Amino acid sequence: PFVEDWDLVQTLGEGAYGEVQLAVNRVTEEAVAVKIVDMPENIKKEICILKMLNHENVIKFYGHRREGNIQYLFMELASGGSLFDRIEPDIGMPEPDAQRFFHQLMAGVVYLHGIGITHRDIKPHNLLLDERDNLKIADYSLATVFRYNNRERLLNKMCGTLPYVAPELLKRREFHAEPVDVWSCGIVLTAMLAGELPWDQPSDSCQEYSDWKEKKTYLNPWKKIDSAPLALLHKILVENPSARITIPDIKKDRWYNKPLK
Ligand SMILES: CC(C)(O)Cn1ncc(Nc2ncc3cc(Cl)c(C4CCN(C5COC5)CC4)cc3n2)c1Cl
């Protein structure tokens, strides 16, 4: 397949809406990524969000091309693949690599929150790496505006991936966008350190979640995590979104600031 001067050489994944392909410009040899979307209101929103994005830990938007009922979303290519592929099942990854990616994830989330944007699907599959292993937050199809004209809007729609969602998202009619993103960053952190997800959803029915609230840290995935990153997770994975730690205080955490090998 092809679009204009770009050849679509290889699939890079597929979401709820479309497929992402590796686009090699036949002339310049430049390699980008193209989200191919079939058929209207959400894509106009997504482009609007993407156009604003200007940060080193956020996937750069290049432009869009419409070819009838098909939309092509040209984005920055992260040659290093995803963070998912760097996590070893049941092991995770080395602590210094986990801390580095967590720092870059915080920088990107701080950025998005700064411009009133919530990602709503922070998980390893949406965290891509460049050639120098710099983390990039990708896929903005679930992203939305939580702040406009310095007025905050509570979210009501239930969006995301169940093992990453904050518990208020399942139990509340309305909730603040930012503690939802902080929570998923905490699950990403857990995955990086234990190569395991803590539960299937943060609901009282799920025993693994109830075990966490009871402080049963002698259980997986918690027993694989060192006491210092575990202290941070104790503050991130808090049920009440008002009691939950914010990025300014995450930036003050001992493990966050711990010099690592
Ligand atoms: C195979 C390999 C060796 O790892 C090479 N490899 N993999 C991916 C890429 N580069 C890359 N760059 C930019 C992209 C932009 C975007 Cl927006 C995406 C989306 C794909 C669909 N996922 C959803 C499915 O579950 C979540 C969300 C992200 C993929 C990209 N992939 C390279 Cl190079």
Number of the ligand 1 atom closest to the C-alpha atom of 139: 17
Q: Is 20 annotated as a binding residue?
A: yes
Q: Are 39 and 18 in contact (CB under 8 A)?
A: no
178 CA from centroid of ligand 1 (Å): 25
The experimental method is X-ray
Estimate to the nearest angstrom the gap between the alpha carbon of 232 and the chain centroid: 18
Read off the tokens for 199: 């539960």
Tell me if residue 19 falls in helix, strand or coil: strand
With a CB cutoff of 8 Å and minimum separation 6, the contacts of 173 are 156
Q: What is the largest CA-CA distance in the chain?
A: 60
> For residue 16, what are the contacts with CB-CB under 8 A and spacing of at least 6?
141
As to burial, measured by CB atoms within 10 angstroms (0-12 exposed, 13-18 middle, 19+ buried), residue 90 is exposed
Q: What is the resolution of this structure in A?
A: 2.5
126 Cβ below 6 A of ligand 1: yes
Active-site residue, 253 included:
no
The annotation status of 35 as a binding-site residue, yes or no, is yes
φ, ψ of residue 43 to 5 degrees: the values are: -70, -35
Backbone angles phi, psi at 195, to 5 degrees: 60, 25
Distance 35 CA to ligand 1 centre (A): 10
Q: Is the CB of 75 under 6 A from ligand 1?
A: yes
